[PDB]
């Protein structure tokens, strides 16, 4: 399906792929009120896959990870709250409310080992160990490991969001307005230190 | 450009605006929405109606 998407051209691989971009391409509908904490990558379709994308996800299977790394893409897991996920998949109504962008929470009492593990491409895991996991995946699935440091778009491919941030451009505490389009910061030290915390 | 939905066009009761329902649904919606503004006898017979209709729709008929 992801290959189908990028072939239809509704999702652009030129930019980092995110869950909001998936939802805006209608690749997957979501039901946050039905407590779906995100999206999973499926083994199906590992063959005939040449995406090269910088896909962001919540759950990933090792086979999908290996296929996308062979093609040269990037995998990143990122846990979201229920309300954080609903504001992600439908950001516009929140902006129609006008409240400041809330900061994400950390994973709950059970998902921290996963999102800190490097084999699962945890956004908490160290970058120093990602080369190791890539190496083991290549050594297992029998495919050369193409280093991505050379290509011009390594910047885009390694663009990532820090914890407690929703979007790559915006951060918590920020406020957005469409009518008379503008963006606002509090510039109050207490709110700043909080939203940074 | 989808500035208005045709359901706010119809002029009528406040609990009947872009909504359809049978006797039970209509009476419960009435008493829930505009029930405090109801007269005494009207609210009384409305509650009696919904009570009768509760037990009718739930106990009586075929298909059970």
């Amino acid at each position: 399906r992801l290959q189908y998407l990028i072939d239809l051209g509704r999702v652009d691989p030129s930019q980092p792929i995110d869950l909001t971009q998936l939802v805006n391409g209608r690749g997957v509908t979501i039901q946050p009120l039905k407590r779906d904490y995100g999206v999973q990558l499926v083994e199906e379709g590992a063959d005939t896959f040449t995406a090269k994308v910088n896909i962001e996800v919540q759950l990933a299977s090792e086979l999908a990870i290996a296929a996308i790394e062979k093609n040269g893409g990037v995998v990143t897991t990122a846990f979201y709250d229920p309300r954080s996920l609903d504001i992600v998949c439908k950001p516009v109504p929140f902006f129609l409310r006008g409240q400041p962008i809330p900061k994400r929470m950390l994973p709950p009492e059970e998902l921290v080992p996963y999102y800190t593990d490097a084999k699962n491409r945890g956004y908490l895991a160290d970058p120093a160990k990602f080369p190791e996991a890539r190496l083991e995946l290549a050594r297992k699935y029998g495919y050369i490991l193409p280093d991505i440091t050379k290509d011009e778009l390594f910047k885009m491919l390694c663009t990532r969001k820090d914890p407690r941030q929703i979007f790559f451009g915006l951060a918590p505490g920020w406020v957005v307005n469409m009518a008379d389009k503008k963006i606002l910061k509090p510039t109050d030290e207490n709110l700043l230190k909080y939203y940074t915390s | 450009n989808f500035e208005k939905h045709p359901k706010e066009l119809i002029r009528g009761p406040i609990w009947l605006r872009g909504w359809k329902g049978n006797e039970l649904q209509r009476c419960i919606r009435k008493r829930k929405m505009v029930g405090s503004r109801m007269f005494a006898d009207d609210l009384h017979n409305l509650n009696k109606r919904i009570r009768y209709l509760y037990k009718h729709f739930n106990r009586h008929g075929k298909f059970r």
């Binding site: - | 503004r37 109801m38 007269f39």
Partner: protein, 243 residues
């Protein structure tokens, strides 16, 4: 047909339109406060959110006050923040048993209470909770002036409130004959509870006697048309003499 307004609005609509409409804003605010009472007959949950022992997740909890019944003798004599409890219970605390009508009546006591501000000792039916809370308040008058109207729930208590506030706002020598030093010491002790004279007058009154006082104040013989005509004619004649 239907009403313009719901039924539960009619009381405050009367409050806004009528003789009571002329009342001062602070009394109307005291009426329209809707302040929560202090719970005596149930231990409230310490927090708004709680983790139940069944499943390991959050659950919101909200305390629920008990519908206490307050007879007239409770208003006549200060009981406290308690009263007769009406309800039902199961026999031998078993759900699988018959429900029965239970009533709980607190243990009252006829006791003396003196206040140096009023300079008189009263005899009142009170409770152990009343005694304990006045003790932790460190003084009777302190308790009366510190207590939330709803926690006091006594017409006698609110009348005492009214009298004490009136006296503190008035600074009268009526209390202490030939004891100005004691008068000043006591007023200095109780200075912070002081409020304006009109406020102390209006406080401690239900709407009926409030509108009655307002009626007694507004009541007067109407000025004679003869008199006002004489006045306006004198004005006109002054104007004509000027011109």
């Amino acid at each position: 047909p239907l009403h313009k307004y719901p039924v539960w609005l009619w009381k405050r609509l009367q409050l806004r339109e009528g003789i009571c409409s002329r009342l001062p804003g602070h009394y109307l605010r005291s009426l329209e406060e809707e302040r929560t009472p202090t719970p005596v007959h149930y231990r409230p949950h310490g927090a708004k959110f709680k983790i139940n022992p069944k499943n390991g997740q959050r659950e919101r909890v909200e305390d629920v006050p008990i519908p206490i019944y307050f007879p007239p003798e409770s208003q006549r004599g200060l009981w406290g923040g308690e009263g007769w409890i009406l309800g039902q219970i199961y026999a031998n605390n078993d759900k699988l048993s018959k429900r029965l009508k239970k009533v709980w009546k607190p243990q009252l006591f006829e006791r003396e209470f003196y206040s140096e501000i009023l300079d008189k000792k009263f005899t009142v039916t009170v409770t152990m909770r009343t005694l304990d809370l006045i003790d932790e308040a460190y003084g009777l008058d302190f308790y009366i002036l510190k207590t939330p109207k709803e926690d006091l729930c006594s017409k006698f208590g609110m009348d005492l409130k009214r009298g004490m506030l009136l006296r503190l706002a008035r600074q009268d020598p009526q209390l202490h004959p030939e004891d100005p030093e004691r008068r000043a010491a006591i007023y200095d002790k109780y200075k912070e509870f002081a409020i304006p004279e009109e406020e102390a007058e209006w406080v401690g009154l239900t709407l009926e006697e409030a509108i009655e006082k307002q009626r007694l104040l507004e009541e007067k013989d109407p000025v004679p048309l003869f008199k006002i005509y004489v006045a306006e004619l004198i004005q006109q004649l002054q104007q004509q003499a000027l011109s």
